[PDB]
């Protein structure tokens, strides 16, 4: 491992990390409009 | 399935949390190291 | 409705815990950028 | 971002999250009391 | 159950995490005083 | 604390997580199929 390539996983692992919650978010949301 | 959706996502976020820890870790080990 | 309340409790707490993975990347490129 | 501000943030942060874990806590309490 | 069982290993994973960032933060605060 | 220490509080928490997410794993196999 370098720090190039470190720097590159951080990068797309932060990423990912947004995608996954924004979907959360999302789903969130609708699991409760399903409930109310 | 809205809610056993939400676990599996919620579970890859962990898994994508714990993926970022063990880079810093790293990280951290080589400024040591230095 | 208990389970939908966790997990919005797990997911505010997944984001409050990203936002401290940020902060310790920010400090470990600051450190390697001085070296 | 300066250093001063990360160690101010790292303390907000670190408690923001240890009151919501707290309140993650006591739910899995309610759930798991309820669920029997 | 299965849903409510699963919520109790990923608040605990959190957790575990949650103290593994601790640990992190140390480091780089050990390694600020010495670096700089 | 000490660099050894941590080091050490570091592999262990990072097996506890890794213990953790696999049975989560496991879980949301199960639930998935019922």
Do not use: C, F, P
């Not at chain 1, 932060?14 to 979907?23: A, K, R, V, Y």
């Not at chain 2, 809205?2 to 080589?30: D, P, S, Y």
């Amino acid at each position: 491992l370098t720090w190039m390539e470190w720097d590159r996983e951080i990068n797309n692992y932060t990423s990912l990390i947004h995608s996954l919650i924004e979907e959360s978010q999302n789903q969130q949301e609708k699991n409760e409009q399903e409930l109310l | 399935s809205g809610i056993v959706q939400q676990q599996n996502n919620l579970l890859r976020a962990i898994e994508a949390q714990q993926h970022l820890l063990q880079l810093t870790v790293w990280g951290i080990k080589q400024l040591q190291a230095r």
